[PDB]
Amino acid sequence: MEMEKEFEQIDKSGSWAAIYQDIRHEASDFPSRVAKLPKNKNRNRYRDVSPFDHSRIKLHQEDNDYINASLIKMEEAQRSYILTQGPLPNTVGHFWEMVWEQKSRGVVMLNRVMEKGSLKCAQYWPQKEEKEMIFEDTNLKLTLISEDIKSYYTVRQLELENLTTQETREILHFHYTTWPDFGVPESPASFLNFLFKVRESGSLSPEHGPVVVHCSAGIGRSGTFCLADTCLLLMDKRKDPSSVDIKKVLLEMRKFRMGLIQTADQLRFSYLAVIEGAKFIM
């Protein structure tokens, strides 16, 4: 079926939970043996969210190459994304090592450091120009260059230096700051505006390594971001945009990381975002 009318048909019939459970039943199951090794317990935020072995990002290290991060490679859309958990106190150096080694231009953050009164990720970037951060375990230096605070999101320019080679690179930090503590946003308008700002920066384009996107577990809000981006790109590329099947795209993405889209409300919100977004593109 088309999307917008499939949408109203699920609303009128109140069957979002049943649709979402079907997706959960059909999703791929691949091994994640490296994630479950005992030496990696303090590298995982949640025991039930792990990268598959076949798609995990490897650190360029011989001691321990493990990080909780996955490469989502979308062949028809010609887009790739790295989805990862919010960094932990003992993985902030690994996180920036990955950004460096994968040649990423942008980092997309969809959570606040504290939500619901608890810490959802480490304070992994510097908050003042004159107070830079040094990650001694991976030999990197990170400096805040500029910050632009808007009503729904903040954009930061960061300098990452590889202290071993003295090479430097500019990284863009795109921080969506207004996702509610509970539920999903009422309108997709600010989320779509944010997606378009990431696109306009070059961070999603083939001349750079894959964008790094995270929330707390790296599957819910993060899944919504890449699902909406890929569906909108396919609607532009195909002769028949009504042929784009958001459930089929989501199942393809779930071949590369488990659990993408965590609730039926996030599934409905993803439909809403693609539907409204397709009208603005034209």
Ligand SMILES: Cc1sc2ncnc(N(C)C)c2c1C
């Ligand atoms: C006026 C300019 S030039 C420039 N180059 C890189 N990053 C920037 N941000 C997002 C702060 C800027 C701004 C705000």
Ligand SMILES: Cc1sc2ncnc(N(C)C)c2c1C
């Ligand atoms: C002159 C340039 S280059 C560039 N790259 C990314 N974003 C931009 N804007 C609009 C915030 C710009 C602008 C305004």
Ligand SMILES: Cc1sc2ncnc(N(C)C)c2c1C
């Ligand atoms: C040279 C660059 S990169 C970039 N990314 C996001 N916003 C920006 N602007 C318009 C403030 C910029 C600028 C000016």
Ligand SMILES: Cc1sc2ncnc(N(C)C)c2c1C
């Ligand atoms: C939903 C939105 S916001 C926005 N801002 C600038 N350009 C856009 N297009 C057409 C690429 C969009 C779209 C499609």
